[PDB]
Amino acid sequence: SELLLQATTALKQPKELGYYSTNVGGELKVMDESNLSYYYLPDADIEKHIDLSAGARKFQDEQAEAEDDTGSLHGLLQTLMEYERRKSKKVNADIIAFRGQVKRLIHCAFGGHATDVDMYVMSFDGQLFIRAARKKLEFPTSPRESWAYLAYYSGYKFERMALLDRPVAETPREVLESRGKQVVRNGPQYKTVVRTGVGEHKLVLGAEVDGIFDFREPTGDNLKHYVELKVAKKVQTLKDATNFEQKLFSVWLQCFLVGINRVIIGFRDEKFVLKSVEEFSTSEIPLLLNACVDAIKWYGALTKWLCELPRGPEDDFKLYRLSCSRGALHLRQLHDEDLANGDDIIPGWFREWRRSLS
């Protein structure tokens, strides 16, 4: 099947189903907020001219050095199982995926690289499970003082300088006075798991969350308290403005998909010094920027298209490659027994869980 990249539709309010904390090296803690950080970046720290390139040489990159399947649904599925177990009921949804993959599908109609839409779709138990085909991320391999390396590292340094492991009230003075000494890491992650929808279809999406902005509600839905952080170059030219608009569009997509309302941008100069930080509401972004309106209509279209795939009992473990080329998304059914029978897309333990649940 194909769907051409060129229909009015409404969004459902996303609801948080659960969350989990992970790291490379096999750490997975389901329904556990250990790795959830808290925003804290006083103006007095910013006024001292934070160098976002500081520490690039001494950085120990956990993600880059791990051999791990970055597309795996295993953490998401373990969290979903725990949610379903507590409820005694299969989640009501059509598609289960990571937010980043759905973002890629949306973005490929609006400037994204067609070449790297590469996903597996598997039907199981009335639902579609979608994962990135590739198992390894691309990390910059240029020297650490290269622009490409600093662009990558600066994101993590900004997070370490703007975030705390716990609320400010629970943080010792020693840490608050010496933010630049704290070790920069990209291993620990915290993800939310959200039920969302567009048009008449529903999705469960996993999504990385950078932190809590204001406070957390221990017994509530925290989507409204989450914040995503991004580093952008301060705008001083046409070229900078265009790059920033594209970054704004991208972070808007990331937040809107899972009901996050808060974005913080760290503006850097050409020397990677943080110049200022600005809060944006997710809703502010389309106003500032019809790409956003059309992206939601495209989201609706592509989701309705995927949901045409057969999802009855006889379709269990059928597998399709999802791609983008010649101005269209494409679905091609595969016949790969090991890949379909192995644990790479839907692991045996989750199959067993859903069977028992039936």
Residue numbers in the entry: 5 to 10, 14 to 296, 303 to 371
Paper passage:
We have found substantial variations in the activity profiles of the Rai1 homologs, and discovered that some of them possess a new 5′ triphosphonucleotide hydrolase (TPH) activity.
The results also consistently show that AgRai1 has the strongest activities in the buffer conditions tested.
